[PDB]
Protein backbone atom coordinates (compact mmCIF):
# COMPACT_ATOMS: atom_id res chain seq x y z
CA UNK A 1 0.00 0.00 0.00
CA UNK A 2 2.00 2.92 -1.41
CA UNK A 3 1.21 6.45 -0.23
CA UNK A 4 3.07 7.89 -3.24
CA UNK A 5 0.48 8.94 -5.84
CA UNK A 6 -0.33 12.13 -3.98
CA UNK B 1 71.70 -12.63 -22.02
CA UNK B 2 72.70 -13.10 -18.38
CA UNK B 3 71.45 -15.67 -15.87
CA UNK B 4 70.95 -14.08 -12.46
CA UNK B 5 70.96 -15.50 -8.94
CA UNK B 6 68.20 -15.45 -6.34
CA UNK B 7 69.16 -13.17 -3.46
CA UNK B 8 67.33 -15.40 -0.96
CA UNK B 9 67.69 -18.97 -2.22
CA UNK B 10 70.67 -18.88 -4.58
CA UNK B 11 68.65 -20.33 -7.45
CA UNK B 12 69.40 -19.38 -11.04
CA UNK B 13 67.00 -16.93 -12.66
CA UNK B 14 66.40 -17.25 -16.37
CA UNK B 15 64.85 -14.40 -18.36
CA UNK B 16 61.26 -13.38 -17.75
CA UNK B 17 61.16 -15.56 -14.64
CA UNK B 18 60.69 -14.14 -11.17
CA UNK B 19 60.68 -10.63 -9.81
CA UNK B 20 63.03 -7.83 -8.80
CA UNK B 21 62.71 -5.67 -5.69
CA UNK B 22 64.45 -2.32 -5.36
CA UNK B 23 64.66 -1.24 -1.73
CA UNK B 24 64.89 2.27 -0.31
CA UNK B 25 68.63 1.86 0.27
CA UNK B 26 68.87 1.40 -3.54
CA UNK B 27 69.72 -2.30 -3.22
CA UNK B 28 68.38 -4.86 -5.70
CA UNK B 29 67.04 -8.25 -4.64
CA UNK B 30 66.27 -10.79 -7.34
CA UNK B 31 63.75 -13.53 -6.64
CA UNK B 32 63.08 -16.58 -8.76
CA UNK B 33 59.62 -17.14 -7.27
CA UNK B 34 56.92 -15.78 -5.01
CA UNK B 35 58.03 -18.35 -2.42
CA UNK B 36 61.40 -16.72 -1.82
CA UNK B 37 59.91 -13.26 -2.28
CA UNK B 38 57.33 -14.00 0.41
CA UNK B 39 59.88 -15.39 2.83
CA UNK B 40 61.99 -12.28 2.26
CA UNK B 41 58.99 -10.06 3.02
CA UNK B 42 58.24 -12.19 6.10
CA UNK B 43 61.84 -11.27 7.03
CA UNK B 44 63.11 -14.82 7.31
CA UNK B 45 66.80 -15.62 7.26
CA UNK B 46 68.06 -17.96 4.50
CA UNK B 47 70.70 -19.59 6.73
CA UNK B 48 67.81 -21.20 8.65
CA UNK B 49 65.75 -22.31 5.62
CA UNK B 50 66.88 -25.83 4.86
CA UNK B 51 66.59 -25.73 1.05
CA UNK B 52 68.71 -22.63 0.45
CA UNK B 53 72.22 -22.62 -0.95
CA UNK B 54 73.32 -20.52 2.01
CA UNK B 55 71.94 -23.04 4.51
CA UNK B 56 73.68 -25.87 2.68
CA UNK B 57 76.95 -23.94 2.58
CA UNK B 58 76.79 -23.00 6.28
CA UNK B 59 76.01 -26.65 7.11
CA UNK B 60 78.52 -28.31 4.75
CA UNK B 61 76.07 -30.24 2.57
CA UNK B 62 77.49 -31.22 -0.81
CA UNK B 63 80.67 -29.17 -0.29
Amino acid sequence: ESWMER
Amino acid sequence: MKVEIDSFSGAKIYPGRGTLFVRGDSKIFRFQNSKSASLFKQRKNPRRIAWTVLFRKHHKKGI
Partner: protein, 136 residues
Protein backbone atom coordinates in the same frame (compact mmCIF):
# COMPACT_ATOMS: atom_id res chain seq x y z
CA UNK C 1 54.59 13.52 -20.30
CA UNK C 2 54.15 16.16 -23.01
CA UNK C 3 55.92 19.52 -23.00
CA UNK C 4 59.32 18.73 -21.47
CA UNK C 5 59.05 15.01 -22.12
CA UNK C 6 61.99 14.28 -24.42
CA UNK C 7 61.06 10.96 -26.02
CA UNK C 8 58.44 8.25 -25.72
CA UNK C 9 57.52 5.79 -22.99
CA UNK C 10 56.54 2.16 -23.41
CA UNK C 11 53.49 1.30 -21.35
CA UNK C 12 54.01 0.18 -17.77
CA UNK C 13 51.36 -0.83 -15.28
CA UNK C 14 49.44 1.97 -13.59
CA UNK C 15 49.44 2.01 -9.80
CA UNK C 16 48.57 5.56 -8.77
CA UNK C 17 44.95 6.61 -9.33
CA UNK C 18 43.87 10.12 -8.42
CA UNK C 19 43.58 10.35 -4.66
CA UNK C 20 46.90 8.59 -4.12
CA UNK C 21 49.39 10.16 -1.75
CA UNK C 22 53.01 9.42 -2.65
CA UNK C 23 56.17 10.45 -0.87
CA UNK C 24 58.25 13.37 -2.11
CA UNK C 25 61.77 12.34 -3.03
CA UNK C 26 63.42 15.75 -3.47
CA UNK C 27 64.50 18.56 -1.13
CA UNK C 28 61.88 21.18 -2.01
CA UNK C 29 60.47 20.99 1.52
CA UNK C 30 57.41 18.87 0.72
CA UNK C 31 56.82 15.53 2.42
CA UNK C 32 54.02 14.05 0.33
CA UNK C 33 52.13 14.68 -2.89
CA UNK C 34 48.41 14.10 -3.44
CA UNK C 35 47.66 13.23 -7.07
CA UNK C 36 44.65 15.00 -8.58
CA UNK C 37 45.27 14.43 -12.30
CA UNK C 38 47.44 12.68 -14.87
CA UNK C 39 48.70 14.32 -18.05
CA UNK C 40 48.02 12.37 -21.22
CA UNK C 41 45.19 10.39 -19.67
CA UNK C 42 42.17 9.17 -21.58
CA UNK C 43 38.49 9.49 -20.84
CA UNK C 44 36.37 6.52 -19.82
CA UNK C 45 33.19 6.42 -17.77
CA UNK C 46 34.01 5.86 -14.08
CA UNK C 47 37.70 5.21 -14.84
CA UNK C 48 40.02 7.05 -12.53
CA UNK C 49 43.01 8.72 -14.21
CA UNK C 50 46.04 6.79 -13.03
CA UNK C 51 49.75 7.41 -13.23
CA UNK C 52 52.84 5.26 -13.59
CA UNK C 53 56.58 5.74 -13.29
CA UNK C 54 57.59 8.59 -15.57
CA UNK C 55 54.23 10.34 -15.77
CA UNK C 56 53.75 14.03 -15.11
CA UNK C 57 50.84 14.45 -12.73
CA UNK C 58 49.05 17.36 -11.15
CA UNK C 59 49.56 17.26 -7.41
CA UNK C 60 48.93 19.13 -4.20
CA UNK C 61 51.05 19.13 -1.06
CA UNK C 62 49.31 17.95 2.11
CA UNK C 63 52.27 17.77 4.50
CA UNK C 64 55.17 20.17 4.04
CA UNK C 65 55.96 23.84 3.74
CA UNK C 66 53.03 26.29 3.88
CA UNK C 67 54.32 28.15 0.82
CA UNK C 68 53.90 24.86 -1.06
CA UNK C 69 50.61 23.83 0.51
CA UNK C 70 47.14 24.90 -0.65
CA UNK C 71 48.13 25.05 -4.32
CA UNK C 72 48.24 22.78 -7.35
CA UNK C 73 51.60 22.13 -9.00
CA UNK C 74 53.14 19.68 -11.48
CA UNK C 75 55.01 16.61 -10.33
CA UNK C 76 56.78 13.63 -11.88
CA UNK C 77 56.54 10.05 -10.66
CA UNK C 78 59.92 8.42 -9.98
CA UNK C 79 58.90 5.31 -8.00
CA UNK C 80 55.79 3.18 -8.43
CA UNK C 81 55.72 0.21 -5.98
CA UNK C 82 53.46 -1.70 -8.35
CA UNK C 83 55.23 -4.30 -10.45
CA UNK C 84 55.60 -3.48 -14.12
CA UNK C 85 57.07 -5.49 -16.95
CA UNK C 86 60.14 -4.37 -18.81
CA UNK C 87 60.61 -5.59 -22.36
CA UNK C 88 63.65 -7.36 -20.93
CA UNK C 89 60.92 -9.58 -19.43
CA UNK C 90 61.61 -8.85 -15.77
CA UNK C 91 58.88 -7.59 -13.47
CA UNK C 92 60.19 -5.08 -10.94
CA UNK C 93 58.84 -2.87 -8.19
CA UNK C 94 59.96 -0.49 -5.49
CA UNK C 95 58.75 -0.43 -1.89
CA UNK C 96 57.17 3.04 -1.99
CA UNK C 97 55.47 5.51 -4.29
CA UNK C 98 57.61 8.57 -4.87
CA UNK C 99 57.54 11.72 -6.93
CA UNK C 100 59.28 15.05 -7.35
CA UNK C 101 57.90 18.55 -7.88
CA UNK C 102 58.50 20.15 -11.27
CA UNK C 103 57.36 22.79 -13.70
CA UNK C 104 55.22 22.04 -16.77
CA UNK C 105 58.40 21.68 -18.88
CA UNK C 106 60.16 19.26 -16.55
CA UNK C 107 62.66 21.37 -14.60
CA UNK C 108 62.89 20.16 -11.02
CA UNK C 109 62.16 22.67 -8.29
CA UNK C 110 64.56 20.89 -5.94
CA UNK C 111 68.17 19.93 -6.52
CA UNK C 112 68.43 16.37 -5.18
CA UNK C 113 66.50 13.11 -5.18
CA UNK C 114 66.59 10.78 -2.19
CA UNK C 115 66.50 7.13 -3.12
CA UNK C 116 66.54 5.50 -6.54
CA UNK C 117 64.66 6.48 -9.67
CA UNK C 118 63.43 4.44 -12.59
CA UNK C 119 65.45 4.44 -15.77
CA UNK C 120 62.18 4.94 -17.64
CA UNK C 121 61.74 8.31 -15.91
CA UNK C 122 65.42 9.22 -16.19
CA UNK C 123 65.30 8.63 -19.96
CA UNK C 124 62.15 10.78 -20.20
CA UNK C 125 63.13 13.73 -17.98
CA UNK C 126 66.81 14.76 -18.17
CA UNK C 127 66.64 17.26 -15.31
CA UNK C 128 65.48 14.32 -13.20
CA UNK C 129 68.37 12.22 -14.55
CA UNK C 130 70.94 14.88 -13.66
CA UNK C 131 69.75 15.26 -10.06
CA UNK C 132 69.37 11.49 -9.61
CA UNK C 133 72.17 9.48 -8.07
CA UNK C 134 71.03 5.88 -8.50
CA UNK C 135 68.96 4.98 -11.57
CA UNK C 136 67.36 1.55 -11.90
Amino acid sequence: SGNGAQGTKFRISLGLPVGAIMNCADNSGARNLYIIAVKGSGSRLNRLPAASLGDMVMATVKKGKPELRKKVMPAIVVRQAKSWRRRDGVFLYFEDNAGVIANPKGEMKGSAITGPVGKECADLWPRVASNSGVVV
